[PDB]
Structure 1
């Protein structure tokens, strides 16, 4: 049997899938710890590794496989169900099995995705610090028409401090915060002027190695909901620019409160894809 994780109806991705738009012919790169390509509920059609000695189609951490399943777990009678289950899914390994990687490897992965015609980049990753090379890579991807999505960070809030991580903080990247199954902001969700939209991030059930399923918490679970939503929109409206996809997501989001804490609110992909 197949389970529908709560995030799929919460963002109204089920409604868009029922219209017949499921991400077909949209290319999404998951820049992470790899993807377990042999998982029965995923179809990884290509990728690249920039982690020395690690293949992109294996995932010794689990994070990348989980993120990938939120985007793209196959619609069948097995496992779970992704936001955009017909996407062309690419594993871009930029983090090792311990979840860390050089920033130049992350840049190489962004560049690979751009050169190879990805429509959407998901970076469920980041840190407190950026770099000129990282900013240039995401800026170039967006300028060349890629929708770039990243986790806002899991640093929470403290007074008025801006805790958005990089690359989410760059203007070319959609910074995604996290809500739970009640649609309440998760306390770990980072905050600040760059926070753009919210998506399900607490208690997110997805694919996990080896051939299994697991529940994780983080803004890095919220980001792939937005990446998948972008792919749903593009599968219905293939001629849109990256900015047009991005604005559909933020202009139709459900208001949750002040943008510092919630951005424009919870994405509603049914409304965004109208």
Structure 2
């Protein structure tokens, strides 16, 4: 029995799936704590940039969780991703403890840019800016990667790095009411929002678990981008990012919500 988590249908991925759009041929890199082998996931490759954890398997559960929001397989078990046919690559830039260095994160993006990744998912952040990080962001961007990052969970009216950088697509979190979740950082650089409360997904030990955060919202956007990329194979990172924003559902102030809630139905139209 397969269930469709609420944010998947909130963003209207099924509407897109019903038109032949599943993210097929789109390469998506998850820069996180790894992705564990799971019966509802198809991991195509990856690398680890965490000294001391040479494997890409997830010792934390955070990346496995994020990954399933993007691409949990559409079959008869578990859950369902926004882009269930996306090619998923596990890029480990965060250790088991759930933290990493800017160095490891910048190496992951470098890797993404060098390996022709179309979308990079960075459900991570820091309140502090990093010149290293920023350059990596910009580099992956000129290599044609769309970088999608979490705004953070401090609840403050200013967003984290790298989401704050012009070249990153900053994602905030909404609740089932289509209100901004209290922890969701907002303000300048915020581009769009997505479901980030009680998000059910894939978890290590072949199970499913629900989490809260902008980390959970980000992957709905990364997925949404793969759907559009499949529909418009000639579009660049910028064209996708703008189409997403242009087709989002307004939810109120752009200070709080940026463009509004991502809408994969409106976007693959």
TM bucket normalised to smaller: over 0.9
| Conserved 8 A contact 1:71-1:82 | yes
SS of corresponding position for 2:173: strand
Instruction: Find the counterpart in structure 1 of residue 44 from structure 2.
Output: 45
SS of corresponding position for 1:177: strand
**Cα distance, 1:12 vs. partner?**
1.1
Residue 102, structure 1, aligned to residue 112, structure 2: no
Map residues 102-181 of structure 1 onto 2, 5 A cutoff: 102-157=101-156, 162-181=157-176
| Conserved 8 A contact 1:152-1:189 | yes
SS of corresponding position for 2:209: strand
| Conserved 8 A contact 1:47-1:56 | no
| Conserved 8 A contact 2:158-2:188 | no
Residue 93, structure 1, aligned to residue 88, structure 2: no
Runs of 4+ aligned residues of structure 1 deviating over 2 Å after TM superposition are: none
Query: Cα 1:167–1:213, aligned 2, differ >3 Å: closer, same or farther?
Result: same
The Cα offsets for residues 240-273 of structure 1, whole Å up to 9 and x where unpaired, read as 0111100011011111111111111101111112
SS of corresponding position for 1:220: helix
What is the rounded CA distance, in whole Å, between the counterparts of 1:233 and 1:105 in structure 2?
29
| Conserved 8 A contact 1:56-1:92 | no
SS of corresponding position for 1:188: coil
What is the rounded CA distance, in whole Å, between the counterparts of 2:122 and 2:87 in structure 1?
17
What is the rounded CA distance, in whole Å, between the counterparts of 2:209 and 2:220 in structure 1?
16
**Runs of 5+ consecutive residues of structure 2 not aligned to the other structure:** none
Deviates more, 1:84-93 or 1:251-260: 251-260
TM, length-normalised to structure 1? 0.96
Instruction: Find the counterpart in structure 2 of residue 7 from structure 1.
Output: 7
SS of corresponding position for 1:122: strand
The Cα offsets for residues 129-171 of structure 1, whole Å up to 9 and x where unpaired, read as 12111100111111221111000111113xxxx4200100000
| Conserved 8 A contact 2:114-2:143 | no
| Conserved 8 A contact 1:71-1:227 | yes
SS of corresponding position for 1:166: coil
Query: Cα 1:56–1:255, aligned 2, differ >3 Å: closer, same or farther?
Result: farther
| Conserved 8 A contact 2:199-2:216 | yes
What is the rounded CA distance, in whole Å, between the counterparts of 1:56 and 1:124 in structure 2?
20
What is the rounded CA distance, in whole Å, between the counterparts of 2:225 and 2:188 in structure 1?
22
Instruction: Find the counterpart in structure 2 of residue 26 from structure 1.
Output: 26
| Conserved 8 A contact 1:110-1:141 | yes
What is the rounded CA distance, in whole Å, between the counterparts of 1:92 and 1:130 in structure 2?
22
What is the rounded CA distance, in whole Å, between the counterparts of 2:101 and 2:252 in structure 1?
36
Deviates more, 1:62-71 or 1:142-151: 142-151
What is the rounded CA distance, in whole Å, between the counterparts of 1:63 and 1:163 in structure 2?
24
SS of corresponding position for 1:227: helix
Instruction: Find the counterpart in structure 2 of residue 203 from structure 1.
Output: 198
